[PDB]
């Protein structure tokens, strides 16, 4: 059961650091480098640097000299990436990722040298200078044979926001869009339902609204 | 050094070969043969393709090959399946105990259809407008290929000011989606006949009105 497990999303402000962690699993950790790479959203992969769990030796990209502070574990397998003086365009998707040390040896071995075979699943550090919000939920009032209703989740901070219908019964006709990010630095989002007509002066429909950052969670009924 | 250089894109047709190209410098890709290429699915971690140049992990498909001439290097796929499709990223050691990817290659493969977004606009809801904020809300889906442009007018003039559009995001059955807010005030929302959202897919234009009553 080889794998590299990264701790939790991360909401930062501008100017502060970010510790960012990776448990391996499975394998001989003082084998392999640990590389870590981070990718903005929509972006490519970048690499940032890495650390040999030998010696703690590291090495990273000139641009991040002075900010990234890569340690290691060795007892409990776990490598750690320190970014500091943060800023908005460090926001993305941060890796682990192992890479052999050496390109063969005594012991037979797969000797992937420098193809990182395995990854973590990835760390959202999200840098923001705006403030933890909770959402204003609208309903979205139905108006050939289907309707579409929906509900209109406005200006939250941070990600995430989880939505269902009449407490998850309703997933027919359901589509959720993915938030967008307003020039407030506050996100939106809205749910739809696509529902036939004839059902409208009959079923009820209630979005549930779940912010857990805020403790904001709001069941809104929509009716015509 | 600096980022390595590929293709924005290519795209084949299923059961053809394509190749994507990776160049560097004579001090990289031109001096050791370390360049390792992964293959990226939506939300998902990068995964090791090719490493040395042209060698395979176990377990990756014998369709995908390496190869390299002078600074660049090259990934090779043969016989295009739909899963194939993807972003393609070499990377290289770059001397100086430094590595480096490449900018990264969507890779397409075409023959899936062409369809036109629906699209849903609602007005500000009587709750907001009591609240004293107004939100028109555009709501785009199922339209391939990905890219959609959303202009809004009030009455016939242009608005660009209050607009926010998120970039399409793929959905479960492989079309994309997208949405738009126009911001108003309520005294702006009551005062024109109607406003209008107006969205672009390959040339083709689907248009939703509402209007204040």
């Known amino acids: 059961q080889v794998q590299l497990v990264q701790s939790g999303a991360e909401v930062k402000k501008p100017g502060a650091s970010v510790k960012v962690s990776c448990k391996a699993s499975?394998?001989?950790?003082?084998?392999?480098?640990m590389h870590w790479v981070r990718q903005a959203p929509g972006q490519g992969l970048e690499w940032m640097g890495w650390?040999?769990?030998?010696?703690?030796?590291?090495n990273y990209a000139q641009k991040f000299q002075g900010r990234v502070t890569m340690t290691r574990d060795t007892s409990i397998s776990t490598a750690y990436m320190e970014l500091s003086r943060l800023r908005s365009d460090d926001t993305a998707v941060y890796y682990c990722?192992?890479?052999?040390?050496?390109?063969?040896?005594?012991?037979?071995?797969?000797?992937?040298?420098?193809?990182?075979?395995?990854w973590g699943q990835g760390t959202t550090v999200t840098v923001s200078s705006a403030s933890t919000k909770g959402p204003s939920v609208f309903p979205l009032a139905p108006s050939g044979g289907t309707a579409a209703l929906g509900c209109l989740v406005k200006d939250y901070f941070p990600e995430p926001v989880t939505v269902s219908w009449n407490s998850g019964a309703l997933t027919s006709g359901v589509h959720t869009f993915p938030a967008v990010l307003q020039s407030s630095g506050l996100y939106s989002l809205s749910s739809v339902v696509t529902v036939p007509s004839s059902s409208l002066g009959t079923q009820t429909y209630i979005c549930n609204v779940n912010h857990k950052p805020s403790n904001t969670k709001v069941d809104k009924r929509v009716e015509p | 050094q600096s980022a390595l250089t590929q293709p924005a894109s290519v795209s084949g047709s299923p059961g053809q070969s394509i190749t994507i190209s990776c160049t560097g410098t004579?001090?990289?890709?031109?001096?050791?043969?370390?360049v390792s290429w992964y293959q990226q699915h939506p939300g998902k971690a990068p995964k090791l393709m090719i490493y040395?140049?042209?060698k395979r992990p176990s377990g990756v498909s014998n369709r995908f090959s390496g190869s390299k001439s002078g600074n660049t290097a090259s990934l090779t796929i043969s016989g295009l399946q739909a899963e194939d499709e993807a972003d393609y990223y070499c990377?290289?050691?770059?001397?100086?105990?430094?590595?480096?990817f490449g900018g990264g290659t969507k890779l397409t493969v075409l023959g899936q259809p062409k369809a036109a977004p629906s699209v849903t606009l609602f007005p500000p809801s009587s709750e907001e407008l009591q609240a004293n904020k107004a939100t028109l809300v555009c709501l785009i889906s199922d339209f391939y290929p990905g890219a959609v442009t959303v202009a809004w007018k009030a009455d016939s003039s242009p608005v660009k000011a209050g607009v926010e559009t998120t970039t399409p995001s793929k959905q479960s059955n492989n079309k994309y989606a997208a949405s738009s807010y126009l911001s108003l005030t309520p005294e702006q929302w009551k005062s024109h006949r109607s406003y209008s959202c107006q969205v672009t897919h390959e040339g083709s234009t689907v248009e939703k009105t509402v209007a204040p009553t």
């Open positions: 499975g394998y001989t950790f003082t084998g392999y480098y």
């Open positions: 990377c290289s050691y770059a001397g100086s105990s430094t590595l480096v």
């Open positions: 040395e140049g042209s």
């Open positions: 650390i040999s769990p030998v010696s703690g030796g590291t």
């Open positions: 990722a192992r890479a052999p040390l050496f390109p063969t040896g005594v012991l037979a071995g797969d000797y992937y040298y420098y193809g990182m075979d395995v």
């Open positions: 004579s001090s990289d890709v031109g001096s050791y043969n370390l």
